[PDB]
């Protein structure tokens, strides 16, 4: 049964041309509160250093306009008696990934000794 969410979800709220809809993806455990008061790129990818209860976590994020309208937002409708209807195409998508920490290419190379010339006669 559709209930009463924030008036920032009603489809009458999102039709604002001055408001943007953005879908974001983060792995199973990404805790959001670190980003609070932080910035996220609007195009391109920038490593961020999040602080989740003091621990320093780093994540590389993706910011680009989506493939054409991959899916729709369902928004509470005032006329439809709570029946949910589709929104517009979101203005962008965000992929969030922790950039690998402390990874170089591999190394400088490693040598081995050379055996060949053996004991020559006594």
């Amino acid at each position: 049964p559709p209930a009463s969410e924030s008036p920032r979800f009603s489809l009458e709220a999102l039709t604002g041309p001055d408001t943007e809809l953005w879908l974001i993806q983060a792995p199973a455990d990404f805790a959001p509160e670190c980003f609070n008061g932080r910035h996220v790129p609007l195009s391109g990818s920038q490593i961020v250093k999040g602080k989740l209860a003091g621990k320093r976590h780093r994540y590389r994020v993706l910011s680009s306009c989506p493939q054409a309208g991959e899916a729709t937002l369902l928004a509470p409708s005032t006329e439809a008696g709570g029946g949910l209807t589709c929104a517009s195409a979101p203005q962008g998508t965000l992929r969030i990934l922790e950039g690998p920490q402390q990874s170089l290419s591999g190394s400088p190379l490693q040598p081995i000794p050379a055996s060949p010339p053996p004991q020559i006669p006594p």
């Binding site: 680009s64 991959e70 992929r95 990934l97």
Partner: peptide
């Protein structure tokens, strides 16, 4: 899970460049 918590997109999800 180890694969997907990196770049790998889920099997039938919305792959951003699909």
């Amino acid at each position: 899970a180890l694969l997907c918590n990196l770049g790998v997109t889920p099997i039938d999800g919305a792959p951003h460049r699909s």
